[PDB]
Amino acid sequence: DDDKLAAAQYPVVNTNYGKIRGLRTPLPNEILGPVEQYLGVPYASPPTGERRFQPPEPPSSWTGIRNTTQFAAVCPQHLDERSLLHDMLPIWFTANLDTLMTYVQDQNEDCLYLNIYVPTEDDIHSKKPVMVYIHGGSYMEGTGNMIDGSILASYGNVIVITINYRLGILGFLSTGDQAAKGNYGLLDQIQALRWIEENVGAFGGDPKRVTIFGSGAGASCVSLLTLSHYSEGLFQKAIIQSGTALSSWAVNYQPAKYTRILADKVGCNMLDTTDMVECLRNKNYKELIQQTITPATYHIAFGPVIDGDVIPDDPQILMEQGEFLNYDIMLGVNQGEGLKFVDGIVDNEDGVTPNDFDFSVSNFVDNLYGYPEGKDTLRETIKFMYTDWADKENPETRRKTLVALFTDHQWVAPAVATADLHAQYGSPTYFYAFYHHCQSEMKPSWADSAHGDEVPYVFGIPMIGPTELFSCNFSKNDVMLSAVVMTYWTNFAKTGDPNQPEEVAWSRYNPKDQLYLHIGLKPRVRDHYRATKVAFWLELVPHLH
């Protein structure tokens, strides 16, 4: 409010931690305004030297102005071109990867930073809502910086915020006791929200209208957050896309042993916890990550522990009955999340063969349900359930059934409880099954919408001449869908009803009816998404032992 032009070219927003000077930028699209950008802003104090493996304390303070105009480095991550967590990342990553790494190089442990996108338009019909994005993967990778919010930010006139949070070995290491309780990542996340809660007002924001939303493995955090002593107050509505806190790879039940594999494999042999944690602390943002620690097929090595506090009991037991507050929750899973499940076993004809179908079910019952040694029944049941007795032979049908298992058993089936349990206790619960996807190379021609295909439609990339990451040939429809998507996502964040603030009626999910939304090219509302098959996994299965 003095140097009119030059000071409105890149603004100057008073935080409680100083003044930050940001950056105004327009967008390429025709019907899309500019958006103020405050890239690389700090929400905590560098988890440095001492702090490492300890929860995050506030950021510091300056005077004058601070140039917040470029994404700061991200956390400890090393990505073995393969020998990563392959099977549960998002398709647009497990390949493409190559130059999806303009955000790899430039890694400093001093990493806790967030980005702010604010819409320029004057709403003089009131303070705009907010949307904090927890980015996924399998923990131990990634950044908020690879997804640009501005497109969403602008379209819905809502503030969008990507964050960076501690990662993997730096961010989730647990002895399982005292010297390193665990869950450091979702805790910076928590501080990100408590920073936001405090400051977002001074940009243009309404801390009573904060919505946290994630990409699946990031949705993990967002679902896990519903359940914390710590979360209450910092957000109101959550959108939980493509998975939950019950996925086999949501919660780490034995960081006991997987810290012992790394301890021994770093000259840190001491057999007393508090002695050992001071060892790893005095190693390096290096070394410790360059270690290959293999989790057990379909688990994680470094991830959220049930410590006793931040995560107080088993997500299943917490959800199972009480203990979350009341979150206005919108969750849903994509059609063929699994896909990566049928790797290699699909011929260049286009299907999977029977005595390859069987070895898959039996390297499923074998992997996931180890120990029961009943199983076999399970196995011959599992594979009875997932064969089409109309087209008993037809090997394309047998390919689809396979991915459809995994898909059911890792996202849909769990995402229907959670969706069931939230309706059960007060929360309004809106639900969606994502069917459409942008189709390109990397992702075969037959793949239905696989895990993580939901993203670019939620962030509006079809209003922009594609990208690395999202190298797909976009149509006019993809645009028209993203429009319907971002309006449903936005309106939800603005109110508690994707509909309300030229389309179809969504309507709330609620175990009597079970209405879901069928987000495809024409959205129609259906009911009981996969009932028979979800009821399989969540009923006659734990019926054993």
Binding site: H229, E232, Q321, G322, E323, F324, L325, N326, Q424, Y425, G426, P428, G496
Partner: protein
Amino acid sequence: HAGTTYIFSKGGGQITYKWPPNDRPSTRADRLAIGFSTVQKEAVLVRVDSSSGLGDYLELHIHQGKIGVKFNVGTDDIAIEESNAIINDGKYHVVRFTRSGGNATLQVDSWPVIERYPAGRQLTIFNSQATIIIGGKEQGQPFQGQLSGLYYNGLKVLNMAAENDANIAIVGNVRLV
């Protein structure tokens, strides 16, 4: 009574809040405060009932002439009464309330802070707080005295009972002093 006063009477005489169905908080901690004066043997004084399908509830009740709380947030029913007191006489008392999960804390006007800590392992949260039934008429056992100056999680129940704001529902033998 040193606030927006309200009387209570013979026959049928009970009030009903109704939270807006999409808006049913559920907290870790509840903070009730309300100062009364009765003359009745058995009764129900107040009650938040959650919703349907939910046995979570919180019920101050005039059993034996001892205004005493009884509540289930999840597992078993907790209950903090002060079972020594013939206080149901017509006299006025300012009976406050604290809760953090299973841990709770009652305190009549100035006497001691009688508090329970069920050792089992209680559940932390109420669920779907919907309707606040001050009167005990719909419980089966009614109450005949009064209340005033109400406070509840920072939501003034009986300043808003006289404003006639949207959500209140007053059907009983009752007054305002």
